[PDB]
Design an enzyme around this catalytic site. Structure first.
Site, PDB file in Angstrom:
ATOM      1  N   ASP A  65       0.683  -1.001  -0.045  1.00  0.00           N
ATOM      2  CA  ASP A  65       0.056  -0.071   0.065  1.00  0.00           C
ATOM      3  C   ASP A  65       0.835   1.230   0.044  1.00  0.00           C
ATOM      4  O   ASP A  65       1.737   1.321   0.998  1.00  0.00           O
ATOM      5  CB  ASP A  65      -0.808  -0.049   1.216  1.00  0.00           C
ATOM      6  CG  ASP A  65      -1.707   1.302   1.380  1.00  0.00           C
ATOM      7  OD1 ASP A  65      -2.262   1.686   0.291  1.00  0.00           O
ATOM      8  OD2 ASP A  65      -1.970   1.811   2.322  1.00  0.00           O
ATOM      9  N   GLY A  66       0.610   2.212  -0.961  1.00  0.00           N
ATOM     10  CA  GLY A  66       1.278   3.262  -1.155  1.00  0.00           C
ATOM     11  C   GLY A  66       1.255   4.291  -0.087  1.00  0.00           C
ATOM     12  O   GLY A  66       2.231   5.030   0.262  1.00  0.00           O
ATOM     13  N   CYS A 115      -4.532  10.524 -15.079  1.00  0.00           N
ATOM     14  CA  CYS A 115      -5.342  10.445 -16.491  1.00  0.00           C
ATOM     15  C   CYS A 115      -6.762  11.013 -16.686  1.00  0.00           C
ATOM     16  O   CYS A 115      -7.635  10.464 -17.123  1.00  0.00           O
ATOM     17  CB  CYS A 115      -5.248   8.948 -16.805  1.00  0.00           C
ATOM     18  SG  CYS A 115      -3.574   8.233 -16.992  1.00  0.00           S
TER      19      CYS A 115
END
Ligand SMILES: [Mg+2]
Ligand SMILES: [Mg+2]
Ligand SMILES: [Mg+2]
Ligand SMILES: [Mg+2]
Ligand SMILES: [Mg+2]
Ligand SMILES: [Mg+2]
Ligand SMILES: [Mg+2]
Ligand SMILES: [Mg+2]
Ligand SMILES: [Mg+2]
Ligand SMILES: [Mg+2]
Lengths: 41, 52, 95, 95, 137, 338
Positions: free
Chosen positions: F191-192, F264
């Site tokens: 998990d970042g 994005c």
RNA sequence: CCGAGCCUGGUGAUAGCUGGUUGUCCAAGAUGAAUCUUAGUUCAACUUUAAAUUUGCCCACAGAACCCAAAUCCCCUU
RNA sequence: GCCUGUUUACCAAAAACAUCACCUCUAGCAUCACCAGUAUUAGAGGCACCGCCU
RNA sequence: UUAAUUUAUUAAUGCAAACACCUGCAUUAAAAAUUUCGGUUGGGGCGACCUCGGAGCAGAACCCAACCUCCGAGCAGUACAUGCUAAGACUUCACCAGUCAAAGCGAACCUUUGAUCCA
């Protein structure tokens, strides 16, 4: 007749087989040599 | 993806076996043991069986 | 199944059983394993070997098949070169 | 003529007995309609001179429509039966 | 038979009144040349996807124009958001441009007043749409 | 449960729901550019071709140039100051032939959105710099980073084992055994958000491509569409996750190190508010100062190949256009001054 | 006694649903899987009967994991 | 709701149904309805007497 | 009804067949006809789930639920003996299915999804 046709075709293909195997292995090895030459550049 | 293909013996026997090769990859030629001949022989891809 | 046919009053055979199972005279039923011809390309050699085997049925499965077939299918058949001739009888069976 | 065929095979009746038909034996598939067959020709022996066909006593293959609508009704032709062929053969050899 | 089936398509499968059918065949007889199926697709494009009604179709001679041109302009407008298919109630958030402004006008005014985009962008969109139709077939 | 209801909602498909959200937000955001962006998004996407530096790069470049594509990357570093991505000219819609395995046994080129390469070129990969990809595991930017040098070490992390497996697939396909087996490539599924604690002030160049609304794919594909009505809660919490991931990246980067936040999506909420909130949170809760670096030169350099929205104060936005259907792509360069 | 008349017939329609299921006496006898499936059924487990022959339960010692409690399993004896 | 009328025989007589008026669509025609009729006709649908502005 | 299956019947056409009428065969419609309404969960919604696997509940053989707390998968990479045979075993509480495997023969010197029928 069918049995002997199969037998003769198999015999002919077997006669050719070692040469074809050697040629295929040589082609693979020479492709790898070309890859290394490309890496060298 | 990968495709199931029919490698056919180049030894003249009716022997064929199915392998898996990437669709984008070149047609396959492979050494394989031919039971009828009782010897390792070349097999060439003949036709695509299915797409998996 | 049909216990009493409308034309003869006899018990009928479930032909789906006859199309799938072999009865050895002694009372055993042999069958193929399900999926033995399906998607072999993704099955390990051991699994394929297990699937290519002829397999016996349970006691209750055998009883069900016996009920579903009539006595014609449970007779001695002296076929010429039956591969199962030796298997049609049991030997050295204690109880 | 419409030619039909049962979808479901009828069990054999026997020698003197008559087949027993059921609901499923009333289902048919059209195997052919003869009216769509290619037209064949009628063999006729002429009796009077007729344009573009013949004069008299010569066997001619004419379209069935013409043969049945113009030649035969008007007496310009007769059926190519063995008797008519024989009679016109004697007529020819008597000339 | 060709005339009869064209008229029968216009009446039965397109629900054009008799007077409307005479008006169509009077303004643009090219409909008769145009094959069935293609004509039905054009009409249904006007009706469902574009939301046009028979009176307006006949008034603007929409059937006269080619299906490729019709799609090229309408899809451009729709993706640009300047055209919206009328909802089930027949209403839209913004009034749509008129068919005369869409098809009757030339490409210049069409891109200058209705789309307010650039000719090069329109050419790119036309090529892209042609590819899309090819792939769809 | 109450079976019968007085009125039920229209039951829109997720694609139309995404279109409605975009129409109601980006229309305000972009004014008169929104119709162009909308048509570009709804039209086909322009794919760039990134040659594999671990293959016959010169031969592949020659083949692409024969196909008339040109390397926009090549004639950009000159003004900006190994990466080579060939793209067709503005207006051209020509596709690139599908990638095929090369002579060396690796795929000759990767067909990827040319817009998903600017963050890599802006991160400023200097030789001998340790690189992190906090969550970016669609391949793409990750493979682009890999195809940068043979004297660099890179780690790629993503919580999703499926996306990690996808990275592994592309690695086996493109990266050779030599580089892939070497420590140069280190992949993980963690998990970042907790990456700040996992490693702190370790990495020099970080790329944080937070999970985003991926507007183009949202409009394209119905499956797992972020705009499905049921998943509104996840859509609403996306900003929190994005802020946390950017904060974790800023914590992991060394003092004076560089990070690139990437997205994005066109949303100003996910583009500029994310970075500003991350700066605020990481300067208060952690007392660490971060400075946003200007990329206006980068914009001018890549104006020819991409169209950029100028009104965005912080970061750079590649908006899609019919001439160059390459966007969307938002990227912001941030140097940790403390 | 009309969201599709009435009568006869098919017709002893079908009903996984409700109700009912008539002498005496004794004995054994109780809580998983799949399923258009959870108001049902099939297999298992349990249960009953009959039969074969030979160990069965209880059971101490010994024995059953690293990571990170009550007990259980197994079986010489008894 | 224009009106008089009709309706759920046996819980609703009403604003519902019909209605003159108006609009739309379809039809160029005879010996069993329409019709022993023929576009000012006939069939179907909508709407609602009527009248004034947009 | 834009649910599924049909067009027998009519109406159109087309193709044959008889030289307006009619038969057969197709296509399109109209009219209809037959049949179905999965399961678990959710009172103030605008759904979620259904198969397989890992962890906890379930601490120590096995086994243990949930609208229970979390996570993951519908394959890829590899090779092409990743062949053939075969003692003895395990087994997801049944069956189906699924596992492991000595010896032997043969080359060489691998780490998850689905039955039957039907084609
Ligand atoms: Mg009555
Ligand atoms: Mg009954
Ligand atoms: Mg008792
Ligand atoms: Mg079922
Ligand atoms: Mg039930
Ligand atoms: Mg009144
Ligand atoms: Mg009453
Ligand atoms: Mg009354
Ligand atoms: Mg009353
Ligand atoms: Mg078991």
């Amino acid at each position: 007749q069918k049995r002997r046709e199969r037998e003769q075709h198999i015999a002919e293909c077997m006669a050719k087989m070692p040469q074809m195997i050697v040629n295929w292995q040589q082609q693979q090895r020479e492709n790898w040599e070309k890859a290394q030459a490309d890496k060298e550049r | 993806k990968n495709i199931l293909v029919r490698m056919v013996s180049e030894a003249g026997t009716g022997f064929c076996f199915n392998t898996k090769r990437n669709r984008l990859r070149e047609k396959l030629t492979l050494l394989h043991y031919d039971p009828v001949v009782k010897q390792r022989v070349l097999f060439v891809e003949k036709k695509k069986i299915r797409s998996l | 199944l049909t216990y009493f046919s409308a034309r003869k009053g006899k018990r009928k055979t479930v032909k789906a059983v006859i199309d799938r199972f072999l009865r050895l005279h002694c009372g055993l039923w042999v069958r193929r394993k399900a999926g033995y011809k399906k998607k072999l390309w993704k099955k390990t050699p051991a699994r394929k070997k297990r699937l290519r085997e002829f397999v016996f049925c349970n006691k209750t499965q055998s009883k069900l098949l016996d009920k579903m077939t009539t006595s014609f299918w449970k007779r001695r058949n002296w076929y010429v070169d039956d591969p199962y001739q030796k298997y049609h009888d049991r030997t050295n069976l204690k109880v | 003529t419409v030619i039909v065929e049962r979808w479901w095979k009828v069990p054999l009746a026997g020698e003197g007995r008559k087949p027993r038909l059921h609901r499923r034996h009333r289902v048919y598939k059209l195997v052919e309609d003869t009216k769509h067959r290619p037209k064949e020709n009628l063999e006729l022996i002429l009796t009077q001179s007729v344009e573009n066909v013949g004069v008299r006593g010569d066997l001619v293959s004419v379209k069935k429509s013409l043969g049945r609508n113009r030649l035969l009704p008007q007496g310009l032709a007769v059926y190519a039966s063995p008797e008519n062929k024989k009679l016109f053969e004697e007529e020819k050899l008597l000339r | 038979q060709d005339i009869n089936d064209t008229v029968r398509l216009l009446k039965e499968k397109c629900l054009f009144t008799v007077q409307q059918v005479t008006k169509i065949l009077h303004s643009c007889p090219s409909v008769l040349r145009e094959d069935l199926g293609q004509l039905e697709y054009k009409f249904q494009y006007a009706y469902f996807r574009m939301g046009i009604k028979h009176p307006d179709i006949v008034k603007s001679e929409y059937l006269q124009y080619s299906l490729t041109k019709i799609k090229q302009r309408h899809i451009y407008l729709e993706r640009l958001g300047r055209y919206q298919t009328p909802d089930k109630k027949g209403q839209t958030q913004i009034p749509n441009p008129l068919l005369k402004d869409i098809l009757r006008v030339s490409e210049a005014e069409f891109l200058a007043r209705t789309a307010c985009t650039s000719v090069e962008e329109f050419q790119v969109f036309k090529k892209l749409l042609a590819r899309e139709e090819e792939e769809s077939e | 449960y109450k079976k019968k209801w007085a009125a039920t909602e229209p039951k829109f498909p997720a694609v139309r729901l995404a279109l409605q959200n975009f129409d109601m937000t980006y229309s305000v955001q972009f004014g008169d550019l929104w119709p162009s962006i909308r048509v570009s998004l709804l039209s086909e996407q322009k794919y760039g071709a990134l040659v594999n530096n671990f293959a016959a790069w010169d031969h592949v470049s020659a083949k692409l140039e024969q196909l008339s594509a040109k390397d926009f990357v090549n004639e950009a570093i000159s003004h900006w100051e190994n990466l080579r991505c060939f793209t067709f000219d503005r207006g051209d819609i020509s596709r690139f032939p599908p990638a095929r395995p090369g002579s060396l046994g690796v795929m000759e080129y990767y067909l990827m959105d040319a817009a998903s390469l600017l963050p890599v070129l802006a991160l400023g990969l200097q030789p001998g710099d340790i690189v992190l990809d906090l969550c970016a595991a669609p391949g793409g930017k990750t493979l682009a980073l890999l195809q940068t040098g043979c004297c660099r070490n890179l780690a790629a992390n993503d919580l999703s084992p499926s996306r990690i497996a996808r990275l592994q697939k592309i690695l086996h396909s493109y990266v050779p055994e030599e580089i892939r087996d070497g420590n140069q490539v280190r992949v993980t599924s963690w998990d970042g958000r907790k990456w700040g604690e996992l490693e702190g002030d370790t990495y020099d160049r970080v790329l944080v491509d937070v999970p985003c609304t991926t507007d183009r794919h949202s409009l394209h594909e119905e499956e797992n569409n972020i705009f499905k009505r049921s998943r509104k809660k996840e859509r609403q919490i996306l900003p929190v996750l994005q802020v946390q991931l950017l904060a974790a990246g800023l914590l992991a980067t060394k003092p004076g190190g560089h990070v690139v936040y990437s997205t994005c999506s066109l949303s100003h909420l996910q583009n500029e508010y994310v970075v500003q909130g991350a700066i605020e949170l990481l300067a208060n809760q952690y007392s660490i100062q971060v400075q946003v670096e200007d990329l206006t030169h980068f914009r001018r350099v890549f104006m020819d190949t991409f169209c950029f929205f100028s009104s965005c104060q912080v970061g750079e936005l590649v908006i899609p256009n019919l001439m160059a259907n390459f966007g969307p792509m938002y990227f912001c360069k941030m140097r940790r001054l403390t």
